[PDB]
Amino acid sequence: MKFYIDDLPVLFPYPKIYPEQYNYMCDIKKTLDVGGNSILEMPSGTGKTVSLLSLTIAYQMHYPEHRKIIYCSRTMSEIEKALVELENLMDYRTKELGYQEDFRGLGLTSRKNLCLHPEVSKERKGTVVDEKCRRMTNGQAKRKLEEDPEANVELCEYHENLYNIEVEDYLPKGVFSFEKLLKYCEEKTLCPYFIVRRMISLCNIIIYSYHYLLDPKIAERVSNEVSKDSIVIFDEAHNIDNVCIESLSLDLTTDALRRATRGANALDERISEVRKVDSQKLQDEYEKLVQGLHSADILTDQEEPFVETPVLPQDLLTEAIPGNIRRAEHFVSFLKRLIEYLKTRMKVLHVISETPKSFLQHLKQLTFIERKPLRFCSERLSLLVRTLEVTEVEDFTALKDIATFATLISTYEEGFLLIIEPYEIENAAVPNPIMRFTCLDASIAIKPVFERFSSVIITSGTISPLDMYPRMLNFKTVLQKSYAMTLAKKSFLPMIITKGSDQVAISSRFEIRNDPSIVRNYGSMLVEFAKITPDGMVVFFPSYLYMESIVSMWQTMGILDEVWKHKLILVETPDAQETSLALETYRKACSNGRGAILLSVARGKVSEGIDFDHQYGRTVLMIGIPFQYTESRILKARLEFMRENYRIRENDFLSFDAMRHAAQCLGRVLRGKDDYGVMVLADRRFSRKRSQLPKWIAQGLSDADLNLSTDMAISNTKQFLRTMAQPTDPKDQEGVSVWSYEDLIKHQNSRKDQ
């Protein structure tokens, strides 16, 4: 299609369009005109990516100013979905117009999946794979390689052929999807990691996980050339406020404290051994500290940086000498004085949430170490370690967390919280204290990204209401509007099973345990679906531990064989590797004749990134209300902070947040308007939260569907499937919800110009 929004061609890759899309198209350009925030709700059943990319890509190719576009998704899995979608649209944009791209657009996932060196790629741990190639292709290791001819230092050689051919230009013209990128890079024996690392200043659009925008330790290479005058795009960003606070979160364990002593004592050996050999550089680095923060070679580091910037990207940084901490022996001494004080603060017999100030003052009372120099731990460690040119990190892995933490808490106050549990309640009565620490307001990290740009886009099919987030992140949008699914057919049956076959108000809030009155009713309720439902059916527990709780007794119950006698059952596994193998086989079985049934957690990772088409998404299950206070009052602590900071209480936020995570899972049942699937839910309180739903979801929910019985619901979904299974192809009223190819959008919307 090629229509206009009164200013720009719209090279829409599909012949068909949708009424939401043009309304989506109407607002995106309108928002694009006035760079703001404009939080909008677009139904996930429609593919917003097409409406997303098409108007934006044209906008850059029509308006000649915004040469850089930024999209931040939740998962790199979404990135490759966007990567091919852009690639297809880029092909289509060329297809409709010829060759008018000259465009650079690539994803960004990690070094782990982009380090093409097989040995480094073979390693499992993401830290090591990063660290290995960091060491394998290091600014100093290559010196140990180039200056001293030796086999001691090897290289990825992908970074080298990067420096040979790749660091003169870009990859020729492709908008490389991850498969296409990896296929190309491997044939060029290239490193897509270092490629995008240097391609930061070259990609006309960049797609990556929110963390590269959010996580300052990886949101630190930010170049204002691609950032300042760019547009920021967010979808499904509702479950990111937690991520933001998670990005500032930090859990500690006395074992790691001993690991810290393991590293910190090893530092004493490391600094002493080089001191006998070459302390002159260390003395020279003291002068490099005497001149300042040694930004000459603590930032100008091709592959040198040991400690990254865990704090926000150098906003709250001082650069003077650290007084006496200039000496490494002194530097470790306060650190060694600290870790034991930390241990002395870790050994608390009960749970204590210590204020950042009082705890710091308490430290000062115990170990008189000043706050401002304490932030220098991160820079000093990154500085010192490379000067030590250590050959290992595992002993020092605990240390960078301290360099993270000690800088963090010394930088952060009255927006963060240090809390020292004496153990974990799930394994209480044993000594396992955690010195848990995190932020409280998510907007704190959002404020710099708020500050840096005006044109920012946020979208979700789940966000409801669209007002908590402006309250939460303390910002003003332009358009706070929700889109409804223009469907002339049901295509999904929202079902609230408050009452079971027993007509019992059934819930997950009662306990995190089993009661067969509710549970066996649930088990009996579930099995009838296995017979009637086709391949594709998933459950979402409120908690993984709660998930396992119900599993064993149902396994003990005879309920287990019949569903196997009906379909295939695949579990959620703590390792995603087995889970992935389950997932593909589940989809394979879903693609296969033998039916497949799944089971997950509403907080599980599947609800985060994994979508399911018509066949793959057929019958979603919400196992009770997804609730999170199974854990401690750290939720309440932030919530109490939330309650005092914002006039939002627990349950209101909880219902908002729980249904947000509930709706987070439910968005994965749909692929397009061709897709469909009944949306069953089983909890007594589900009837109350009819308002908390997103509009189209709430619109799709009739009031007659509340507190339904499973038996009556079984009849309800019974007819739905056959009707949907029936080839409902009117081909005349479809154009009402299709806005027939290049005509109705041209005709109707231009008619609707009044």
Partner 1 sequence: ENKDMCPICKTDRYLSPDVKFLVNPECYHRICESCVDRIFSLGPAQCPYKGCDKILRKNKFKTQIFDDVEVEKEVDIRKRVFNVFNKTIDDFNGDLVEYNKYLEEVEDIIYKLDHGIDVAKTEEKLRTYEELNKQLIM
- Give the footprint of ligand SF4 on this chain (CB under 6 A): 111, 115-117, 120, 133, 136-137, 156, 158-159, 191, 193-194
8 Å CB contact between 538 and 667 = no
Q: Quick check: 432 binds partner 1 (CB under 8 A)? A: no
Sign of CA dihedral 500, 681, 621, 553: negative
* Cα–Cα dist 587/590, whole Å: 4
Query: Which C-beta is closer to ligand SF4: that of 196 or that of 601?
Result: 196
96, 154, 246, 340: residue in contact with partner 1 (rule CB under 8 A): 340
What is the smallest separation between the CB atom of 247 and ligand SF4, expressed in angstroms? 24
Query: Which C-beta is closer to ligand SF4: that of 30 or that of 198?
Result: 198
8 Å CB contact between 483 and 514 = no
Query: Which C-beta is closer to ligand SF4: that of 304 or that of 441?
Result: 304
113, 353, 367, 524: residue in contact with partner 1 (rule CB under 8 A): 367
What is the smallest separation between the CB atom of 569 and partner 1, expressed in angstroms? 43
Query: Which C-beta is closer to partner 1: that of 32 or that of 328?
Result: 328
What is the smallest separation between the CB atom of 165 and ligand SF4, expressed in angstroms? 14
What is the smallest separation between the CB atom of 404 and partner 1, expressed in angstroms? 21
Helix (H) or strand (E) holding 495: strand 494-496
Q: Could you tell which of ligand SF4, partner 1, none binds residue 466, using a CB distance below 5 to 8 A set by kind?
A: none
Q: Could you tell which of ligand SF4, partner 1, none binds residue 580, using a CB distance below 5 to 8 A set by kind?
A: none
What is the smallest separation between the CB atom of 284 and partner 1, expressed in angstroms? 16
Query: Which C-beta is closer to ligand SF4: that of 74 or that of 159?
Result: 159
2, 183, 228, 330: residue in contact with partner 1 (rule CB under 8 A): 330
Alpha-helical (H) ranges within 367-507 are 371-374, 376-388, 394-411, 443-452, 468-473
Which residue, 610, 611, 612, 621, is CA-closest to 591?
A: 612
Mark the segment that binds partner 1 (CB under 8 A) among 26-34, 305-313, 324-332, 508-516.
324-332
* Angle at the Cα of 156 from the Cα atoms of 155 and 162, rounded to 5 degrees: 110
Query: Which C-beta is closer to partner 1: that of 324 or that of 750?
Result: 324
Q: Is the peptide bond before 13 cis (omega within 30 degrees of 0)?
A: no
What is the smallest separation between the CB atom of 154 and ligand SF4, expressed in angstroms? 9
Q: Quick check: 452 binds partner 1 (CB under 8 A)? A: no
What is the smallest separation between the CB atom of 334 and partner 1, expressed in angstroms? 8
* Cα–Cα dist 514/551, whole Å: 10
What is the smallest separation between the CB atom of 123 and ligand SF4, expressed in angstroms? 10
Query: Which C-beta is closer to ligand SF4: that of 108 or that of 606?
Result: 108
Q: Could you tell which of ligand SF4, partner 1, none binds residue 3, using a CB distance below 5 to 8 A set by kind?
A: none
* Cα–Cα dist 676/724, whole Å: 8
**Strand boundaries in 111-215, DSSP class E:** 205-209
8 Å CB contact between 654 and 717 = no
Q: Quick check: 94 binds partner 1 (CB under 8 A)? A: no
* Cα–Cα dist 340/358, whole Å: 18
Which residue, 211, 220, 212, is CA-closest to 247?
A: 211
Q: Quick check: 327 binds partner 1 (CB under 8 A)? A: yes
Mark the segment that binds partner 1 (CB under 8 A) among 107-115, 142-150, 219-227, 327-335.
327-335
* Cα–Cα dist 8/54, whole Å: 11
What phi and psi, each to the nearest 5 degrees, are found at residue 287?
Answer: -65, -40
The residue written with tokens 């899972």 in the block is: 665
77, 333, 632, 748: residue in contact with partner 1 (rule CB under 8 A): 333
Amino acid at 740: S
* Cα–Cα dist 335/343, whole Å: 12
Alpha-helical (H) ranges within 392-515 are 394-411, 443-452, 468-473
Q: Could you tell which of ligand SF4, partner 1, none binds residue 142, using a CB distance below 5 to 8 A set by kind?
A: none
Q: Quick check: 372 binds partner 1 (CB under 8 A)? A: no
Give, as one character, the DSSP assignment of residue 75. Answer: -
Query: Which C-beta is closer to partner 1: that of 329 or that of 578?
Result: 329
Query: Which C-beta is closer to partner 1: that of 144 or that of 336?
Result: 336
Q: Quick check: 324 binds partner 1 (CB under 8 A)? A: yes
User: What string of H, E and C letters represents the secondary structure of 266-305?
Assistant: HHHHHHHHHHHHHCHHHHHHHHHHHHCCCHHHHCCCCCCC
Question: In Å, what is the CA distance from 690 to each residue of 145, 647, 649?
Answer: 65, 22, 19
15, 126, 292, 323: residue in contact with partner 1 (rule CB under 8 A): 323
DSSP letter for each residue of 317-348: ---S--GGGGSHHHHHHHHHHHHHHHHHHHT-
* Cα–Cα dist 318/328, whole Å: 19
Query: Which C-beta is closer to ligand SF4: that of 115 or that of 582?
Result: 115
What is the smallest separation between the CB atom of 161 and ligand SF4, expressed in angstroms? 9
What phi and psi, each to the nearest 5 degrees, are found at residue 169?
Answer: -160, -165
Mark the segment that binds partner 1 (CB under 8 A) among 24-32, 44-52, 319-327, 631-639.
319-327
Query: Which C-beta is closer to partner 1: that of 276 or that of 751?
Result: 276
* Cα–Cα dist 111/89, whole Å: 27
Query: Which C-beta is closer to ligand SF4: that of 118 or that of 593?
Result: 118
Query: Which C-beta is closer to partner 1: that of 2 or that of 364?
Result: 364
223, 318, 344, 552: residue in contact with partner 1 (rule CB under 8 A): 344
What is the smallest separation between the CB atom of 731 and ligand SF4, expressed in angstroms? 52
What is the smallest separation between the CB atom of 333 and partner 1, expressed in angstroms? 6
* Cα–Cα dist 298/320, whole Å: 14
8 Å CB contact between 739 and 673 = no
Residue list 253-272, contact with partner 1 (CB under 8 A): 261, 272
8 Å CB contact between 209 and 75 = yes
**Could you list the residues that contact partner 1 (CB under 8 A)?**
261, 272, 321, 323-324, 326-327, 329-330, 333, 336-337, 339-340, 343-344, 347, 367-368
